[PDB]
Design a protein around this ligand. Structure first.
Ligand SMILES: [Cl-]
Ligand SMILES: [Cl-]
Ligand SMILES: [Mg+2]
Ligand SMILES: [Mg+2]
Length: 257
């Protein structure tokens, strides 16, 4: 099953979650109920852009203890507070488990302020944990030095061809968990056809997608494979029954230059 990762604030998070994806608002409830039945307990609603009413309905009708669920969401575009408050209403929840704000600005003149706001959100109990996205080592050092609060999570683009090692190393050194955004390259390159990928799939009797997912997992990363078809939901979840060897992992790691 899905292992629970330790967050720096005392909370634990299921390593693999369901990313609500490609679902019109009316079918959202049904989709989440399906993920719940499959076995997912970690839900990420980012991709639905605030169309969370259906998510709330599913949770409410699920029968699952609040404490057994992990609700994640992110602010896309002074407004995290307004944003989260609205989401809470839609979700019919007192708080979410994890809240993340957007990539720092090219102007880099507000990410600190943004972090201060997140800290207040947390203090206000709107979210149990606070994290960031696309924060580089310098961004991270800056917010920590400025606020004294270390993010629980840092969401960054991550896949074999692009690993952002500086970030992951730093994170590991400071107890920050990494969430792999676009874990499978987003179909931008031939990931499934890569020798290191096919080789692992073949050896373990898994699919290439599965092998890659496993790679992230063994590396200690948090992932939200964006599933649509039940078949995929299933496969995406069934990646805890095998282990890539150290050699298998290194071959994949070598995919980046
Ligand atoms: Cl709640
Ligand atoms: Cl992807
Ligand atoms: Mg340090
Ligand atoms: Mg070993």
């Amino acid at each position: 099953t899905v292992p629970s990762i330790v967050l720096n604030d005392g909370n634990s998070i299921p390593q693999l979650g369901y990313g609500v994806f490609k679902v019109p608002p009316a079918d959202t409830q049904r989709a989440v109920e399906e993920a719940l039945e499959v076995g997912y307990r970690h839900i990420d609603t980012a991709a639905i852009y605030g169309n969370e009413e259906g998510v709330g309905a599913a949770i409410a009708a699920s029968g699952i203890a609040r404490d057994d669920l992990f609700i994640t969401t992110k602010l896309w575009n002074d407004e995290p507070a307004a944003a989260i408050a609205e989401s809470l209403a839609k979700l019919a929840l007192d708080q979410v488990d994890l809240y993340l704000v957007h990539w720092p600005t090219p102007a880099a003149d507000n990410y600190v302020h943004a972090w201060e706001k997140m800290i207040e959100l947390r203090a206000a109990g709107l979210t149990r944990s606070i994290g960031v996205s696309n924060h580089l080592v310098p961004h991270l050092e800056r917010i920590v030095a400025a606020t004294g609060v270390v993010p629980a999570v840092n969401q960054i683009e991550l896949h074999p061809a692009y690993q952002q090692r500086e970030i992951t190393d730093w994170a590991a050194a400071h107890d920050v968990k990494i969430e792999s955004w676009g874990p499978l390259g987003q179909g931008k390159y031939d990931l499934f056809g890569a020798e290191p990928v096919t080789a692992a799939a073949a050896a373990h009797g898994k699919t290439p997608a599965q092998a890659v997912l496993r790679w992230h997992l063994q590396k200690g990363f948090v992932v939200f494979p964006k599933s649509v078809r039940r078949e995929r939901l299933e496969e995406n979840l069934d990646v805890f029954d095998f282990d890539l060897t150290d050699t298998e992992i290194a071959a994949i790691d070598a995919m980046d230059p």
